[PDB]
Design a protein around this ligand. Structure first.
Ligand SMILES: CCCCCCCCCCCCCCCCCC(=O)OC[C@H](CO[C@@H]1O[C@H](CO[C@H]2O[C@H](CO)[C@H](O)[C@H](O)[C@H]2O)[C@H](O)[C@H](O)[C@H]1O)OC(=O)CCCCCCCCCCCCCCCCC
Ligand SMILES: CCCCCCCCCCCCCCCCCC(=O)OC[C@H](CO[C@@H]1O[C@H](CO[C@H]2O[C@H](CO)[C@H](O)[C@H](O)[C@H]2O)[C@H](O)[C@H](O)[C@H]1O)OC(=O)CCCCCCCCCCCCCCCCC
Ligand code: CLA
Ligand code: CLA
Ligand code: CLA
Ligand code: CLA
Ligand code: CLA
Ligand SMILES: CCCCCCCCCCCCCCCC(=O)OC[C@H](COP(=O)(O)OC[C@@H](O)CO)OC(=O)CCCCCCCCCCCCCCC
Ligand SMILES: CC1=C(/C=C/C(C)=C/C=C/C(C)=C/C=C/C=C(C)/C=C/C=C(C)/C=C/C2=C(C)CCCC2(C)C)C(C)(C)CCC1
Ligand SMILES: CC1=C(/C=C/C(C)=C/C=C/C(C)=C/C=C/C=C(C)/C=C/C=C(C)/C=C/C2=C(C)CCCC2(C)C)C(C)(C)CCC1
Ligand SMILES: CC1=C(/C=C/C(C)=C/C=C/C(C)=C/C=C/C=C(C)/C=C/C=C(C)/C=C/C2=C(C)CCCC2(C)C)C(C)(C)CCC1
Ligand code: OEX
Ligand SMILES: [Ca+2]
Ligand SMILES: [Cl-]
Ligand SMILES: [Cl-]
Ligand SMILES: [Fe+2]
Lengths: 38, 81, 455, 334, 341, 137
């Protein structure tokens, strides 16, 4: 169970970091019109 | 447009409100008096607060006979002393 | 001469009447007006409602029996009450109400002024009070002023608790009373420990705060954090990473605040439903868990008086009728209230030992005041109809009661929810508007038409 | 371009058959976990002690259920609102007895569905659309949050969350009526107007547009071939449609502005269902439906029953029977 | 030339309220049904039929007022004012529940009138009569629930009474006595209603969020013209969005709108069929395999058996007051109850 | 039916003496009962001990008898267990315990008589419903 817990924690952390860094990676610019929004 | 005068023209006119400052309060008051004189009870056969039961009974005057229903209700109404 | 002569129409603004307030986005003077006048409305309500409550208040009768939500807030701050939350003086309630109501005239005055008489835009009048939503430095500066203002407000709670009479403490030794807090918790491991705990059962995140020392110390931290952050924002401008992360516009900022207020609303809902420390049950009525626990206490007491050995009484299912174990072994009340074993309250804690409810204390030490309180709470459970018929849904008319906890939880859930909807609406719109397609697709330049087919 | 840049480009790509996106990076694993656990549990899970009284309820197909009676059964009342992941159990056998699958499924589902909503915003932004489809979806989403999370919170237990099954749903509904008189609550009433109205307006709109399709086909072919995907011109005569509906009621009850019409189609069911969700979410804190029990009294003081009192008798029947072994004390307080 | 054609001309004139031949049936029947309901809920009792107060006059509110069904002893009497029960006495007629048959029958003919109006107007304007066709669903529902159902039961007494709370009672009765939630015909009905509301919402939202920019206003409603030839929103963009979000999408607007007709209409029709079965107590009450297992095995429990215990509660607790003509007396000791409650 | 003087005539004591309550007295008693008692005694039952109700026959068999005005007034000043054996002011609302039960604090002799009057009159109106619980709702 300890191994399962750690495995899930790492998995969840991995995807959450994808979400956060993903939306930090110039998201307003990812549209088909006005890109320079900073 | 359908040929009649627009509602917005009618309900913003002096003629309309002259007519309806009489008729609206009159209908409203007639309704009030239909109830306040107790006529509403008599027309519809609705029990007044003192007409659901005779003094001691706790049994509902339920109609149990299709064709003598008229008489049964009449009997129930007599039993209200 | 014309009805379209002003800028206050769809023809000039691009917004219909039902979106009328959107005409104010770049009219900083009238917008200031709207905001100050609105703040007036909030203050007016705090004032008028308190006086309404007081006029209707029978001081010896419990507050929670009287549809009060504001007097309980004032009482929790230590004003007007003594031991057990008894009302000793209604005048502090009168003062709070009057002063809010008088202050609302001033805000209302200034709001009306700025909205219809004062300068429509502030930029040509003053570069200090004027602003451009897109001016990132000016935005963080005003944010900064307000952060300092909020920091101060938090320190005012601290001041009240520490120097100006204290706060109502339901946990006060020997019974609930107003207590001066002399040793606020400053240890960041305790304070930020709350922020890191699970929101789930038996943990409850910040809603679990259970002593005034933690509450007061938390506000010392919040006060200083907010003041430091206020200074930070007046002295800095947003870093590159932040510039590229956000949308920079009035509507975007509105949307961020909407998401924040939604979150806070949901938090407040849970706070008033579960917490009996900053929402004392003396003032707000028992929590749902509390009243459920209180029922079990009540029948444990009655049946034990009759000769029942409550520790050994086996219920129909095999579990103890009065007492059982939690999943980690603590002795807890039985029946459906098994779910509520995380409940903690001053009437119950004296019966608690290291392993949970203590059979010897239950047999020997239950005081008449505990019996009274459990009975009171069991019969004031936060259940009732919309028309304020107290009790279960099948209860007959007789008792005029809905718990303040229910009024406050339901209202704030509804508000938190619509505020999330508002956040989505304005966040989506702000994105669309910044990118330039909030009004629809350019027929001559339809983006999907330049994309390859999916299949 | 570095590896992270390429990854971000693929994630947010408008050319993927199914859009991924950042909300999708959370949505995909959470929905797959919920779905897989749901399917395995619905087929093969052993009985679950939902009410914490050591009286296990069988939900799965292999343990004697059909499609209609089967469910993933809520976690134990002994658990309450405690977080019960697999790793908090001594064994899978314990986790199963206590209704662990239910927690795993509902939490992954709620997170996944919340991200489904974000994903709808996200793709709209990538495609240069207006942003509010996600706002419409917030209505059913809010309703799911109400029955799986908010109700459990208010009542103190996930054992009171809606079961993941057809008969389990009906159970939830009947108990809810007994305990909240939901029928007599104006927010549920708004919900009904929302869904009856939604279905009415769905049928109405569908019938009116169908009624006014421009002739483009012969009798030996489907009228649907008269419209070609992506054509510029409208496929029906809205003037004819309006001319019919305006005469059916009266001219001004009929929409002539298609934008106004389609906004109304969005708003009516969405607003009604937001209220439905708020009904459940506020009844979660026991502010219940109207109670007119014994509201009508005669001159002597005799109770004169109304239909509300008859409803109350039905509610009592539900109340006294539900969870027949769980209550030891006279009042059902959660 | 000729009175019929002259009458036809006048009936079909384009006025604010279209009349038509259909109006001769529709207007009086709809008016009397609505007026019957307002009159009964305002002034009329249910004391002699049900032992119930049912009007504002007696102290009921909007939620509790009703026009109640006649007593069970009336059977399926038409209960005409001049019939052998009321014998032309208006007051007695009201007290016997005559307004219930009044509203049901005038309401039925009014519905016929409305659907004829849908046909009449469609023919005159020159559109296909799909709106009338769609209206067959409300008609199937009304007829099955307010006519067929009580006609299979003992009397009109068991039809729905016309009232908010009264209708709620009808729902709960169907749960406790018919196990109506278990019925797959009701389930299809639920699917059509919820699916219809879903389609309504999703289509409305989709159009409103794939609009072309056809004006400079931030409020986008003005930028539409009733006579414009062009689609106001992008079908192509809508299709891509849903294909990528959900996996499938409409590509054909005509199919889309026909499907919007099909779903809620079919759903209502299915629920009507189930109610026709319930007229005869032909319920989906039980699963036999479940009952055989449960009877032999006192540890076997499902949500299905849990719901039947609730139903048994409903029947025993509601029956004596809900069915006063039966004169049920259930001693306290025979009432099914779990522990404590 | 109506609320007659006959209905409002209840035993004043155990010796056969009665008082006729005024309509006003009854309504005040009902109001005060709701105010101070119904949280536990709604409809004639007792929520914190359902074994003891407020039915006339039950009050008649209490010690001392409680099926009359004077017995009920005495109960409201100095409540006892059903056998008369223990004084229960400390856990039951009374004038004697108006300090810990504040809703009792300003009740006069006329107030208690009114409450007592309501308790004896209710069953004469409601029958089995009074003290009957949910079965009779
Ligand atoms: C950007 C950020 C978004 C990121 C989202 C992803 C992160 C996950 C969020 C968490 C999800 C909620 C988990 C369950 C919440 C809950 O059980 O909440 C309850 C907790 C409180 O928990 C309780 O807290 C109690 C504390 O009281 C204790 O202490 C008290 C002290 O007085 C008393 O003594 C009391 O008796 C004693 O029990 C106990 O611990 C209880 O056992 C415990 O259950 O509230 C709290 O943590 C406060 C926070 C809860 C907020 C409510 C969430 C509602 C969300 C709305 C969704 C709608 C969306 C619509 C879409 C369209
Ligand atoms: C879709 C289309 C849209 C159009 C909708 C608008 C149409 C509105 C107008 C229709 C109104 C018809 C009302 C019919 C009333 C009725 O039936 O009233 C019922 C009477 C029979 O009377 C009943 O009869 C019962 C059995 O009695 C018999 O048995 C008893 C016991 O042994 C005794 O012996 C008794 O004397 C003997 O007569 C009981 O006595 C009942 O109390 C009594 O009401 O039949 C009769 O009038 C006539 C019976 C035959 C014709 C029925 C056709 C119409 C109904 C079709 C649905 C059938 C429902 C079956 C369930 C499925
Ligand atoms: C909190 C609520 C609130 C507030 C503070 C405002 C504020 C404002 N709105 Mg918005 N609005 C609101 C809600 C609100 N609105 C709602 C609910 C709708 C939909 C009906 C609208 C629709 C709308 C539209 C379409 C427009 C506005 C506009 C405006 C601004 C100019 C109004 C004007 O020119 O007055 C002219 C009216 C008067 C002079 C009549 C008197 C009004 C005063 C303020 C009443 C004061 C009463 C008070 C009791 C006085 C006591 C004072 C005492 C303290 C001494 C103003 C800042 C306009 C705008 O944006 O300007 C550029 C605009 O076009 N509003
Ligand atoms: C946080 C908000 C809040 C809360 C929790 C309460 C709670 C309470 N109030 Mg107070 N009050 C408030 C704000 C609030 N009020 C406001 C804004 C006013 C000005 C009208 C008042 C004025 C007031 C008076 C005069 C009284 C109370 C009283 C009461 C009590 C009885 C409530 C009742 O019976 O409601 C009945 C329930 C309703 C009327 C239902 C409201 C439903 C609304 C209309 C729907 C809201 C949905 C949402 C916001 C709409 C969004 C639409 C969407 C499409 C965008 C209760 C303690 C009474 C009391 O006991 O005083 C001692 C009393 O006499 N309140
Ligand atoms: C958000 C609040 C707010 C803000 C930012 C402004 C901003 C402005 N006001 Mg407006 N006003 C307000 C609210 C506000 N007002 C209120 C509540 C009233 C009613 C009293 C007014 C009545 C008013 C009038 C009649 C006029 C203005 C004017 C001005 C302008 C110049 C003011 C100045 O010279 O400052 C310098 C002022 C000081 C240095 C003194 C400040 C001392 C304050 C009062 C005490 C500080 C304590 C604390 C922060 C108060 C917190 C209160 C809180 C609890 C609510 C500027 C655009 C003028 C204008 O627009 O010119 C055409 C003008 O004629 N205001
Ligand atoms: C109303 C309050 C408020 C607002 C609106 C802002 C707004 C801003 N701040 Mg300031 N800040 C504040 C208060 C506020 N601040 C206070 C009180 C302090 C003192 C501590 C600071 C100290 C501060 C610093 C040092 C910085 C900012 C920065 C910024 C900017 C970007 C922030 C950001 O990206 O957040 C979004 C957050 C992230 C992108 C990080 C991820 C956060 C995780 C994923 C969320 C976890 C929270 C969870 C959901 C719930 C909480 C519980 C949790 C503990 C478990 C933005 C202008 C930055 C800036 O540009 O300054 C010039 C910056 O460097 N702020
Ligand atoms: C089209 C309009 C319309 C329709 C369809 C109905 C329909 C109905 N009414 Mg309503 N009614 C209406 C308008 C209408 N009403 C209006 C305007 C009023 C206010 C005056 C009323 C007031 C009213 C009351 C008070 C009642 C009804 C009732 C009824 C029901 C029974 C009627 C009956 O038995 O008639 C029988 C008569 C006919 C069907 C007419 C037949 C005429 C034939 C065709 C003549 C035959 C001529 C022949 C061809 C000649 C051959 C010659 C040869 C011998 C050589 C039925 C549902 C009753 C009901 O609802 O009870 C519950 C009831 O009590 N109605
Ligand atoms: C201001 C009203 C408060 C919002 C309430 C929620 C209703 C509107 C949102 C529904 C979401 C549907 C999904 C998206 C559908 C969608 O995409 O809509 C799009 C539609 C048109 O978009 P536009 O871009 O033209 O306008 C919105 C902004 O850009 C401002 O111009 O938005 C509106 O019409 C907003 C109208 C608000 C004005 C009032 C709305 C009426 C509701 C009032 C509440 C009364 C009911 C209470 C009684 C029970
Ligand atoms: C802009 C605008 C608006 C708004 C407005 C506002 C929101 C405002 C306000 C306002 C306000 C917010 C106000 C106010 C006020 C107040 C006052 C005026 C006061 C006062 C007071 C007093 C007089 C007092 C007294 C007393 C005392 C001292 C004691 C006890 C008793 C008494 C109570 C008697 C609107 C929507 C229309 C629209 C258009 C624009
Ligand atoms: C007073 C008090 C206290 C305390 C408190 C505290 C100390 C606090 C806090 C707090 C805090 C410290 C907080 C917070 C927060 C945060 C947040 C809420 C966040 C956020 C974020 C966001 C929203 C983001 C977003 C995003 C992303 C994710 C990525 C990209 C993009 C964006 C940017 C959009 C206590 C409990 C002891 C007790 C009682 C009282
Ligand atoms: C039965 C009958 C008849 C008849 C009758 C009629 C035709 C009547 C009528 C009637 C009517 C025609 C009535 C009425 C009425 C009404 C009312 C009573 C009303 C009301 C209302 C209201 C109260 C309102 C409200 C509301 C709503 C709805 C919603 C929104 C808001 C509000 C809140 C505004 C005849 C002689 C043939 C014969 C025998 C029997
Ligand atoms: O777990 Mn499911 O159902 Ca809510 O109330 Mn208490 O807990 Mn049980 O009883 Mn009734
Ligand atoms: Ca203009
Ligand atoms: Cl229990
Ligand atoms: Cl159950
Ligand atoms: Fe459409």
């Amino acid at each position: 169970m300890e191994t399962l817990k750690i495995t899930v924690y790492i998995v969840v952390t991995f995807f959450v970091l994808l979400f956060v860094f993903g939306f930090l990676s110039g998201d307003p610019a990812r549209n088909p019109k006005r890109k320079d929004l900073e | 447009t359908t040929g009649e005068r627009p509602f917005s023209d009618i309900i913003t006119s002096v003629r309309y409100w002259v007519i309806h400052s009489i008729t609206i309060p009159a209908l409203f008051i007639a309704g009030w008096l239909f109830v306040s004189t107790g006529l509403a009870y008599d027309v519809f056969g609705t029990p007044r607060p003192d007409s659901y039961y005779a003094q001691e009974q706790r049994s509902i005057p339920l109609v149990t006979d299709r064709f003598e229903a008229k008489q049964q209700v009449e009997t129930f109404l007599e039993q209200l002393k | 001469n014309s009805i379209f002569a002003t800028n206050r129409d769809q023809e000039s603004s691009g917004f219909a009447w039902w979106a009328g307030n959107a005409r104010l986005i770049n009219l900083s003077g009238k917008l200031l007006g709207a905001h100050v006048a609105h703040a007036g409305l909030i203050v007016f309500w705090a004032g008028a409602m308190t006086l309404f409550e007081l006029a209707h208040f029978i001081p010896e009768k419990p507050m929670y029996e009287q549809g009060l939500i504001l007097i309980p807030h004032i009482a929790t701050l230590g004003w007007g009450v003594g031991p057990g939350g008894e009302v000793v003086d209604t005048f502090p309630f009168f003062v709070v109400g009057v002063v809010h109501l008088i202050s609302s005239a001033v805000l209302g005055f200034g709001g009306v002024y700025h909205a219809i008489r004062g300068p429509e835009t502030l930029e040509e009048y003053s570069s200090f009070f004027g602003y451009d939503w897109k001016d990132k430095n000016k935005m963080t500066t005003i944010l900064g002023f307000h952060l300092i203002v909020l920091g101060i407000g938090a320190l005012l709670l601290v001041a009240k608790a520490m120097f100006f009479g204290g706060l109502y403490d339901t946990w006060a030794p020997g019974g609930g009373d107003v207590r001066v807090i002399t040793n606020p918790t400053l240890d960041p491991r305790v304070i930020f420990g709350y922020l890191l705990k699970s929101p789930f059962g038996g943990e409850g995140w910040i809603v679990s705060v259970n002593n005034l020392e933690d509450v007061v110390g938390g506000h010392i931290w919040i006060g200083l954090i907010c003041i430091a952050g206020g200074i930070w924002h007046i002295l800095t401008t947003p870093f590159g990473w932040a510039r590229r992360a956000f949308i920079w516009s009035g509507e975007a900022y509105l949307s961020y605040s909407l998401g924040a207020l939604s979150m806070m609303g949901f938090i407040a809902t849970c706070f008033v439903w579960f917490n009996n420390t900053v929402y004392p049950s003396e003032f707000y009525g028992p929590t749902g868990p509390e009243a459920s626990q209180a029922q079990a206490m009540t029948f444990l007491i009655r049946d034990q008086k009759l000769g029942a050995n409550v520790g050994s009484a086996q219920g129909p299912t095999g579990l103890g009728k009065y007492l059982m174990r939690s999943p980690t072994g603590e002795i807890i009340f039985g029946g459906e209230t098994m779910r509520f074993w995380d409940f903690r309250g001053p009437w119950l804690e004296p019966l608690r030992g290291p392993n949970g409810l203590d059979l010897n204390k239950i047999k020997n030490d239950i005081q008449p005041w505990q019996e009274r309180r459990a009975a009171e709470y069991m019969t004031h459970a936060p259940l009732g109809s919309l028309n304020s018929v107290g009790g279960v849904a099948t209860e007959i008319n007789s008792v005029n009661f809905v718990s303040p906890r229910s009024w406050l939880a339901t209202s704030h859930f509804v508000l938190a929810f619509f505020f999330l909807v508002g956040h989505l609406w304005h966040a989506g719109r702000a994105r669309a508007a910044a990118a330039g397609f909030e009004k629809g697709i350019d027929r001559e330049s339809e983006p999907v038409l330049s994309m390859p087919s999916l299949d | 371009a570095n590896l992270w840049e390429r990854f971000c480009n693929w994630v947010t790509s408008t050319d993927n058959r199914l859009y991924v996106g950042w909300f999708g990076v959370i949505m995909i694993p959470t929905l797959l976990a919920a779905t897989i656990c749901f399917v395995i549990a619905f087929i093969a899970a052993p009985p679950v002690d939902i009410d914490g009284i050591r009286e296990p309820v069988s939900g799965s197909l292999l343990y004697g259920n059909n499609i209609i009676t089967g469910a993933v059964v809520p976690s134990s009342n002994a658990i309450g609102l405690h977080f019960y992941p697999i790793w908090e159990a001594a064994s899978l056998d314990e986790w199963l007895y206590n209704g662990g699958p239910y927690q795993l499924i509902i939490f992954h589902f709620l997170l996944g569905a919340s991200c489904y909503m974000g994903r709808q915003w996200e793709l709209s932004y990538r495609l240069g659309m207006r942003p509010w489809i996600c706002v419409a979806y917030s209505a059913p989403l809010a309703s799911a949050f109400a029955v799986f999370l908010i109700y459990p919170i208010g009542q103190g237990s996930f054992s009171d969350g809606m079961p993941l099954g057809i008969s389990g749903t009906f159970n939830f509904m009947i108990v809810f009526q007994a305990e909240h008189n939901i029928l007599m609550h104006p927010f549920h009433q708004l919900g009904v107007a929302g869904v009856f109205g939604g279905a009415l307006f769905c049928a109405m709109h569908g019938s009116l547009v169908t009624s006014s399709l421009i002739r483009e086909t012969t009798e030996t072919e489907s009228a649907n071939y008269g419209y070609k995907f992506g054509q510029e011109e409208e496929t029906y005569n809205i003037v004819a449609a309006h001319g019919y509906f305006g005469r059916l009621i009266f001219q001004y009850a009929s929409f002539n502005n298609s934008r106004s019409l389609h906004f109304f189609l969005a708003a009516w069911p969405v607003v009604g269902v937001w209220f439905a969700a708020l009904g459940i979410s506020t009844m979660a804190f026991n502010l219940n439906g109207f109670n007119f029990n014994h509201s009508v009294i005669d001159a002597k003081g005799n109770v004169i029953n109304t239909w509300a009192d008859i409803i109350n008798r039905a509610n009592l029947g539900m109340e006294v029977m539900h969870e027949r072994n769980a209550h030891n004390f006279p009042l059902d307080l959660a | 030339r000729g009175w019929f054609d002259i009458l036809d001309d006048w009936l079909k004139r384009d006025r604010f309220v279209f009349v038509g031949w259909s109006g001769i049936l529709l207007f009086p029947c709809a008016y009397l049904a609505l007026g019957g309901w307002l009159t009964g809920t305002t002034f009329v009792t249910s004391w002699y039929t049900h032992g119930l107060a049912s009007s504002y006059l007696e102290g009921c509110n909007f939620l509790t007022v009703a026009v109640s069904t006649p007593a069970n002893s009336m059977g399926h009497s038409l209960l005409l004012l001049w019939g052998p029960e009321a014998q032309g006495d208006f007051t007695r007629w009201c007290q016997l529940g005559g307004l219930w048959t009044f509203i049901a029958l005038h309401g039925a003919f009014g519905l016929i009138g409305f659907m004829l109006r849908q046909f009449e107007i469609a023919r005159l304007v020159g559109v296909r009569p799909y709106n009338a066709i769609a209206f067959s669903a409300p008609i199937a529902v009304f007829v099955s629930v307010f006519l067929i159902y009580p006609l299979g039961q003992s009397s009109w007494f068991f039809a729905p009474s016309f009232g908010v709370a009264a209708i709620f009672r009808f729902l709960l009765f169907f749960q406790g006595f018919h196990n109506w939630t278990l019925n797959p015909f009701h389930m299809m009905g639920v699917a059509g209603v919820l699916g219809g509301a879903l389609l309504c919402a999703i289509h409305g939202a989709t159009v409103e969020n794939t609009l072309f920019q056809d004006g400079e206003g931030a409020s986008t409603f003005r930028a539409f013209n009733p006579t414009q030839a062009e689609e106001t929103y992008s079908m192509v963009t809508a299709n891509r969005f849903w294909s990528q979000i959900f996996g499938i999408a409409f590509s054909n607007k005509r199919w889309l709108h026909f499907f919007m007709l099909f779903v809620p209409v079919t759903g209502l029709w299915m629920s009507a069929i189930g109610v026709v079965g319930l007229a005869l107590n032909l319920r989906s009450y039980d699963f036999i395999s479940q009952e055989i297992r449960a009877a032999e095995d006192p540890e076997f429990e499902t949500f299905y058996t849990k719901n039947l215990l609730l139903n048994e509660g409903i029947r025993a607790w509601m029956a004596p007051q809900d069915q006063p003509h039966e004169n049920f007396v259930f001693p306290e000791e025979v009432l099914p109850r779990g522990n404590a409650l | 039916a109506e609320l007659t003087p006959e209905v409002l005539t209840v035993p004043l004591n155990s010796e056969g003496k009665t008082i006729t309550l005024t309509e006003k007295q009854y309504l005040e008693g009902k109001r005060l009962f709701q105010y101070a008692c119904a949280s536990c005694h709604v409809g004639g039952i007792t929520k914190t001990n359902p074994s003891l109700d407020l039915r006339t026959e039950t009050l008649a068999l209490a010690t001392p008898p409680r099926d009359n005005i004077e017995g009920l007034v005495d109960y409201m000043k100095n409540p006892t267990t059903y056998d008369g054996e223990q004084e229960i002011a400390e856990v039951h609302p009374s004038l004697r315990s108006a300090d810990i039960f504040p809703k009792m604090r300003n009740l006069t002799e006329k107030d208690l008589v009114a409450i007592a009057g309501h308790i004896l009159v209710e069953p004469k109106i409601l029958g089995d419903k009074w003290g009957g619980g949910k079965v009779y709702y």
